[PDB]
Amino acid sequence: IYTQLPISAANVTIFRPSTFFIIAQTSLGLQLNLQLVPTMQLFMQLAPKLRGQTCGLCGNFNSIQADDFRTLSGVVEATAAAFFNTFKTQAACPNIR
Amino acid sequence: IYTQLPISAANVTIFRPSTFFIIAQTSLGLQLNLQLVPTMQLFMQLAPKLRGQTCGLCGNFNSIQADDFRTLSGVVEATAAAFFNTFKTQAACPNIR
Ligand SMILES: [Ca+2]
Ligand SMILES: [Ca+2]
């Protein structure tokens, strides 16, 4: 549903600090800063309580850079593209090299 | 949720033909024209399939004006105010004389 900021939804509040940014704060310790001018950029912030618990393109948040390229299969890839291609959501998406 | 027109929701479509009117059409044979400029006025149109079945401030749609002041109790009131006050939704609302 195309809504209108600001919103106080279930556990999440989204608002516009200015005409350039959109900020979405959750009660789980996750904040999103979204720059829309000139191009979209994302700054995600995670609370310290989620250290070693998350996983995805942003790593597992355990202060170790080496294992940030570890896929869901349990091995650490050697290149950024190989680890990147394992987090697609659709089959038709190309394999980036 | 504060939405933006047009909306195609379940069994209803709401749009803005102009800056003065909002039109909401349902699949049950009901249509609402809402004039917003200069003051809010309503025109409801009902399909013939609902003749003799509805009931409210707009009558029972049975081509008889005599029973249009019939309340849910079962009798026809004599004044517009007495029948009008029986279709309140809250107890604290005043009784119009
Ligand atoms: Ca890590
Ligand atoms: Ca009638």
Side-chain angles (χ1 to χ4, degrees):
Chain A
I1 291 171
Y2 189 159
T3 54
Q4 174 136 353
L5 302 190
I7 330 179
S8 313
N11 278 312
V12 60
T13 156
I14 309 133
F15 59 97
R16 270 174 230 259
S18 68
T19 60
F20 286 15
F21 274 77
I22 286 180
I23 290 174
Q25 161 80 44
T26 64
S27 65
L28 330 171
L30 168 62
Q31 207 169 7
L32 276 66
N33 291 61
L34 282 160
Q35 172 178 350
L36 311 168
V37 173
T39 69
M40 209 157 162
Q41 298 182 335
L42 176 58
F43 310 88
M44 230 180 324
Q45 191 170 356
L46 217 67
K49 83 181 86 166
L50 288 154
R51 280 190 172 269
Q53 289 165 48
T54 59
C55 55
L57 290 186
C58 284
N60 60 318
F61 199 18
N62 71 335
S63 298
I64 298 174
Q65 302 193 349
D67 64 351
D68 273 19
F69 276 1
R70 173 185 284 138
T71 62
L72 289 176
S73 292
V75 289
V76 172
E77 316 278 79
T79 42
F83 155 80
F84 192 79
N85 294 332
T86 60
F87 279 112
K88 309 178 315 179
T89 51
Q90 313 171 348
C93 307
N95 263 331
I96 302 308
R97 57 209 74 280
Chain B
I1 294 166
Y2 186 158
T3 45
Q4 284 134 225
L5 296 188
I7 322 160
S8 281
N11 283 359
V12 64
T13 166
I14 310 147
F15 58 95
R16 227 183 284 255
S18 65
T19 52
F20 285 22
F21 277 79
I22 289 182
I23 292 176
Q25 170 94 47
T26 69
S27 63
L28 313 114
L30 173 61
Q31 200 181 9
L32 272 64
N33 286 239
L34 300 117
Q35 174 184 350
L36 308 164
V37 175
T39 63
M40 215 207 174
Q41 294 179 150
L42 180 65
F43 313 86
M44 262 174 324
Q45 202 183 4
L46 213 67
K49 85 179 86 170
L50 293 150
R51 283 191 171 273
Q53 300 167 351
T54 54
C55 58
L57 286 186
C58 287
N60 51 346
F61 198 17
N62 71 337
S63 294
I64 295 176
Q65 303 190 354
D67 64 350
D68 266 14
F69 279 1
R70 165 179 290 134
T71 58
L72 295 172
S73 290
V75 292
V76 169
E77 305 282 80
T79 48
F83 151 82
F84 185 85
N85 294 328
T86 52
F87 275 110
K88 302 180 317 181
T89 41
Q90 309 166 346
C93 307
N95 270 329
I96 308 302
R97 265 156 295 83

